């Protein structure tokens, strides 16, 4: 509807200098086109009547001059319209991506990432590709139609008769067609996103597919999705063709009726043969211009009204607390729970944590153990302010965890995931991930601290060697060591080792046991079994969301 276009104009406002230039030129373009027929008719009649070489040359010369003047302005206008289209598209994509990252983690479980990417790719183009031709035709018809209506002075009391019996017929059909056209476009979009998700899944996890030999199954699934999209495409095209047919028939009928009425006027009215054909031209032109303008306006409305979910994502407010501000220069490292109970927001009414009251202090390693699905990982997530507790509170240094600044909290408190994920890029940019500035002297110390230098040197370009997507060019132990180095390089005060030693071999399992060597860190280790944490100062046993 018009509400979304108002937002579209709101974000299109920075491009006004291009729009005024485009309006400026197209006005010049049409004022140039309005002069060509004069000299064309002049040269035609001079060639047909008594021939004269001299008047011929002047007429053709002025025709050439005006043809230069109009053509330059037309091409010079199309260029700027095309450029502002791309500017709008890029701004829309950038703002959509900047808004997606701001969402809470619950949003990313409810929606598939492949569909998100397919929407970000396709819906913005659907939003902005119509500009270089829809706006040009609409504006040109809008300026030209005013002149033909102003020629109502030919026969005054009949163009009102045009206005009062032409509108209601056309307007209703446009509304009826648009109501279905917008819906079918929205369905086409929500089907194409679902089709793209299949390609996302098939290509992302291709090694498993090849291990199970199911390439043809995925091909069949994608072909089914493409057929589902093709049906909607055909429906939209057929309905558009039907609307075009009915529009043509209505225009022909009304023109025939007015021709009959104009003939009926000439017997006694203030009309003559010379005036009648003079009037008919203006009436035909105004009818064609208005019937093109209505169609263009309706199409422009629904194109925007089709990709509504992009606007919904753009202005969605995440389910997060207000950003923190606290950032003391010194952080003690004391963290404690207070009757913390949690249930995941995506499937609530299913308590994972019943109640926890443990406390941690610096230099005293604490081990958390429990069966599969006990709730250790959710405790680690709550410590990192990834989810908010539904009961009680999490206090760090006697302050609520949500009150610390994001860039400071995530610099002081870091963790190692159960299965870490590494981003594509150089190894030094993975170890120093998320840091504005980091010298190689710190990265090489972090590599030594994580027993990583023994294999980094063997790479193709040393520490500058590229790593494939998701870390698919390294062994599992090498990924684990890089993840450990990533947490170590940030000199954290609170370190959470969520099953970090699972993928390592016995030499590294025993060598890195002394995480409290510095003696000024609050270290939490999560272990599947009690044996590996016999050295822990404090041991917490968790089952069914309750600690022993």
């Amino acid at each position: 509807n018009k509400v979304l276009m108002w937002r579209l104009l709101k974000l299109s406002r920075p491009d006004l200098p291009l729009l005024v230039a485009a309006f400026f030129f197209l006005v010049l373009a049409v004022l140039g086109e309005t002069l060509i027929p004069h000299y064309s008719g002049r040269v035609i009649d001079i060639l047909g009547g008594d021939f004269d070489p001299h008047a011929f040359a002047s007429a053709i010369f002025f025709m050439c001059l005006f043809s230069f003047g109009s053509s330059l302005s037309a091409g010079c206008r199309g260029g700027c319209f095309t450029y502002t289209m791309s500017r709008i598209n890029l701004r829309i994509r950038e703002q959509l991506f900047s808004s997606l990252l701001r969402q809470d983690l619950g949003f990313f479980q409810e929606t598939k990432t492949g569909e998100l990417n397919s929407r970000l790719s396709s819906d913005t183009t659907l939003m902005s590709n119509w500009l270089p031709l829809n706006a040009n035709v609409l504006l040109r018809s809008l300026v030209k139609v005013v002149g033909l209506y102003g020629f109502m002075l030919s026969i005054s009391p009949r163009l009102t008769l045009l206005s009062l019996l032409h509108m209601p017929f056309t307007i209703a059909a446009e509304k009826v067609y648009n109501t279905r056209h917008q819906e079918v476009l929205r369905e086409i979009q929500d089907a194409v996103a679902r089709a793209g998700q299949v390609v996302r899944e098939a290509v992302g996890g291709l090694q498993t597919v090849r291990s199970f030999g199911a390439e043809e199954h995925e091909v069949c699934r994608y072909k089914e999705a493409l057929e589902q999209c093709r049906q909607l495409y055909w429906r939209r095209d057929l309905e558009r063709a039907l609307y075009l047919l009915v529009r043509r028939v209505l225009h022909l009928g009304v023109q025939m009726l007015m021709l009959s009425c104009g003939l009926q006027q000439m017997q006694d009215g203030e009309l003559t043969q010379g005036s009648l054909l003079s009037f008919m031209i203006y009436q035909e032109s105004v009818g064609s211009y208005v019937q093109t303008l209505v169609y263009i306006y309706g199409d422009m409305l629904s194109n925007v009204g089709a990709a509504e979910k992009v606007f919904s994502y753009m202005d969605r407010q995440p389910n997060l607390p207000s950003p923190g501000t606290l950032a003391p220069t010194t952080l003690q490292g004391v963290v404690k729970f207070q009757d913390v109970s949690f249930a995941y927001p995506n499937r609530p009414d299913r308590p994972v944590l019943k109640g926890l009251t443990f406390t941690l202090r610096p230099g005293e390693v604490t081990a958390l153990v429990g069966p599969n699905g006990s709730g250790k990982s959710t405790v680690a997530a709550l410590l990192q302010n990834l989810y908010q507790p539904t009961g009680g509170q999490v206090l760090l240094d006697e302050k609520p965890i949500s009150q610390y600044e994001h860039c400071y909290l995530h610099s002081q408190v870091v963790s190692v995931g159960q299965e870490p994920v590494l981003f594509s890029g150089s190894v030094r940019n993975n170890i120093a991930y998320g840091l504005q500035s980091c010298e190689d002297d710190k990265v090489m110390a972090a590599a030594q601290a994580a027993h990583a230098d023994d294999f980094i040197q063997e790479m193709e370009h040393g520490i500058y060697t590229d790593v494939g997507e998701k870390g698919s060019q390294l062994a599992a132990g090498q990924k684990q060591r890089l993840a450990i180095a990533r947490a170590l390089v940030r000199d954290p005060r609170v370190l959470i080792l969520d099953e970090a030693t699972s993928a390592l071999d016995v030499q590294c399992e025993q060598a890195l046991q002394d995480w409290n060597s510095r003696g000024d860190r609050t270290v939490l280790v999560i272990a599947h079994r009690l044996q590996t944490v016999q050295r822990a100062h404090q041991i917490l046993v968790l089952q069914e969301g309750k600690l022993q």
């Binding site: 086109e33 309005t34 002069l35 060509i36 027929p37 004069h38 064309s40 008719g41 031709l133 040009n136 035709v137 040109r140 030209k144 002149g147 033909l148 075009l244 529009r247 043509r248 225009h251 022909l252 023109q255 025939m256 021709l259 054909l277 003079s278 008919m280 031209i281 035909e284 032109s285 064609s288 019937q291 093109t292 169609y295």
Partner: protein
Amino acid sequence: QRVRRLLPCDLDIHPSHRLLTLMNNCVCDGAVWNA
């Protein structure tokens, strides 16, 4: 003479949107000038 026309009035609109007319060449921008 007023020779008939077999092409759309505007060349930048797809022929599917042609909107057939009765007067043909009498409808173009040349007749908007007229005099």
